[PDB]
Design an enzyme around this catalytic site. Structure first.
Site, PDB file in Angstrom:
ATOM      1  CB  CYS B  41      -0.926  -0.021   1.187  1.00 13.62           C
ATOM      2  SG  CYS B  41      -1.783   1.424   1.283  1.00 13.62           S
ATOM      3  CG  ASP B  43      -1.799   3.921   4.270  1.00 12.37           C
ATOM      4  OD1 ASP B  43      -1.821   5.354   4.310  1.00 12.37           O
ATOM      5  OD2 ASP B  43      -2.803   3.535   4.230  1.00 12.37           O
ATOM      6  NE  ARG B  45       0.676   4.931   8.379  1.00 17.09           N
ATOM      7  CZ  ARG B  45       0.631   6.217   8.528  1.00 17.09           C
ATOM      8  NH1 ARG B  45       1.873   6.662   8.787  1.00 17.09           N
ATOM      9  NH2 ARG B  45      -0.636   6.888   8.203  1.00 17.09           N
ATOM     10  CG  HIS B  97      -0.761  -1.457   6.215  1.00 14.51           C
ATOM     11  ND1 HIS B  97      -1.140  -0.323   6.949  1.00 14.51           N
ATOM     12  CD2 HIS B  97      -1.381  -1.123   4.868  1.00 14.51           C
ATOM     13  CE1 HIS B  97      -1.685   0.482   6.209  1.00 14.51           C
ATOM     14  NE2 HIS B  97      -1.494  -0.018   4.902  1.00 14.51           N
ATOM     15  CB  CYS B 100      -5.041  -0.286   5.426  1.00 11.76           C
ATOM     16  SG  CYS B 100      -5.165   0.517   3.550  1.00 11.76           S
TER      17      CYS B 100
END
Ligand SMILES: [Zn+2]
Ligand SMILES: [Zn+2]
Ligand SMILES: [Zn+2]
Ligand SMILES: [Zn+2]
Lengths: 213, 214, 213, 214
Positions: B41, B43, B45, B97, B100
């Site tokens: 993604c 994102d 993280r 994850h 999300c």
């Protein structure tokens, strides 16, 4: 192998849990990224390492040869979300010298489906044929790598997403960078734009300052 | 951190390496095809490099919102095709994850704008498994959806002409469906690993069945 | 209204059922189309009417300003199916003078999402800036309409779909046409290509014969 | 018919009109925005102009294989957005047709190449309604799928940010789901007409329910 990776994750996690049990605590602390990085899938050197940015400060998108196609909804969705929702202040398009996507586009090898994607880079190669032509064979691919980043920055700036964000006064700056695998040193192509007007001016002077150099 | 800060870090970082460990750039210079394709993604993280403990250049990467592999997304499909037919990656990993923002926004359609169209693909899944999720303890639905999504994308990937062709050609490629959370950063194999057309159809159902019976 | 249309269909069907009950019999006779028509959604004048082609001989695709974007999977799927499965012998890209898509691209009106699609036409406007610049204000949009068709034909020819079909020896010819609403008379832009080599030559001479005219 | 034949027909056709009915080109010259947006299949077995009995210029048209309105297809979405926000069409029609080669190929995945990826979107539907179709008299499944597909695309359209926004703005737009066969060329309203967000959700279920109970 997959086994090795799984092993690594376990150890890596275990370690941190002990040494710094706060590491995951910080991450748990919702920190909206402030930068959007658009790079190549090759990812020779991770953005976080090149810039020292820590995970969570970077929203990321990656495709072959770091393109921002006028009509690619995948990249546009990432851009719109990052800009309108996350409200990132900076978007960076980063290319890299020796990129396989860039080379394949010119050395037109029948690679399959991927060649359609690469036709967008080929358009650029032909657009700047005189400049590219009037220079050393060995300098063309690298110059094309830079021209590509500058063209994608220009595309990004002309997207309805960017035009509408700037028109309404939102603070967003877009940049075009590149780096080589021989030193990992980022080179600012200097096409940084903060509005629709500077976008044009920076695009113009950027392309022209290459012909001079 | 402003832009000039990032450029400063890079300058210093590169200088130390050039001096301290010139070997870094030699390893990089040595053209060694990536062996894994990571689809995560936007994102991001926790960077896949950290998660797996891999060196730069060992991973071919693709990132989009909520890590989707849409039937007709030429962006992701081109990354896949290049990786499989050209770089010949042996493994392809689709990693999601928990937490999300894309998965969450998909079920809470906050009228976020353009991005919502992309998220309707997750919503289709949310509805598809309405019973499994309806018999879920609410506060555990988003995390479930997160896993359901990954599995669906793995399914879509296995069914891409790219993958079907490769497997038919007898090429060795395995696709995986993982997930992790930001409390331990520990990867959970969603048990939907496929190495061919047959395994794909089976492992898929035997991946969804797990959750709907556990 | 929707009611009127439904009424029309009924009557239209009823009529034919009587006069020519064989009409639907012919259609029932599986006739693979031999031509693929790629035109604009405006569809000022249906392809069937312009050419006298009867339904079933034409496989059709329509989008705003009749584009064939390097990476638009919708159009590419139509092309690949038509070429590899239906085995059409001819593909025709047809533009039309006065096209709203073409005009909007230049008169850059903030129309919303659609503007991203139109940026591909804008690229063309800028690519041929000198030519367009060295001519009457009133002739530019029409010339751009033609340049667009020629550029899309070029894109079609460079798609992996066309390159691979020609390489394996399949017989496929691609054409670029345009017409006006004042007489509906088709004008052949003369960029017809039957292989990868003629594609280049026809593209080159086509663009140059415009600068002369 | 070779290319030169088609060009010949046009030349003659245009000459007669220019002479016989100059009014044709006057009507056309008169800029009158289309009021309907037609989304049909590339097969175009019977042109929508014939079917509806409309004059040229009254319809804004879009055609793709198996008439799909994919969540993330910018081609179709751009046509829609332009029609709705710019031309302000009052009606949008998604018309399918029994016997469609796309629908058929989708369930018989003949390894047709690139096009199969586009067709996986129809396959998703085929599986989604596995019971309704499983309790079907086989030789009636493809025609059912054909109708199911149209309904799903109508659903996707109503859920596009484009449509949601327009309806929220209070703009008058109605979306329809039709189908016809090449034995009578008669249009069957699939009864999934929606004029707003509420009606959309309802008519959708009350469109699928019909078939699953009739
Ligand atoms: Zn690269
Ligand atoms: Zn996410
Ligand atoms: Zn037009
Ligand atoms: Zn069809």
């Amino acid at each position: 192998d997959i086994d090795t990776l799984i092993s690594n994750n376990a150890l890596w996690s275990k370690m941190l849990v002990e040494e710094d049990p706060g590491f995951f605590e910080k991450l748990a602390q919702a920190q909206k990224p402030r930068f959007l990085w658009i790079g190549c899938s090759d990812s020779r050197v991770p953005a976080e390492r090149l810039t020292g940015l820590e995970p969570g400060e970077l929203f990321v998108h990656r495709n072959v040869a770091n393109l921002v196609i006028h009509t690619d909804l995948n990249c546009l969705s990432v851009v719109q979300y990052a800009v309108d929702v996350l409200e990132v202040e900076h978007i960076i398009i980063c290319g890299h010298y020796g990129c396989g996507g860039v080379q394949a586009a010119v050395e037109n090898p029948e690679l399959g489906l991927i060649n359609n994607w690469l036709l967008h880079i080929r358009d650029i190669w032909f657009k700047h044929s005189s400049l590219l032509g009037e220079m050393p064979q060995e300098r063309r691919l690298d110059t094309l790598c830079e021209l590509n980043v500058m063209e994608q920055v220009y595309n990004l700036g002309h997207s309805t997403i960017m035009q509408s964000a700037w028109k309404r006064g939102q603070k967003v700056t877009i940049h075009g960078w590149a780096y080589g695998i021989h030193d990992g040193l980022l080179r600012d192509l200097d096409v940084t734009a903060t509005n629709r007007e500077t976008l044009e001016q920076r695009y113009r002077h950027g392309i022209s300052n290459l012909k001079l150099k």
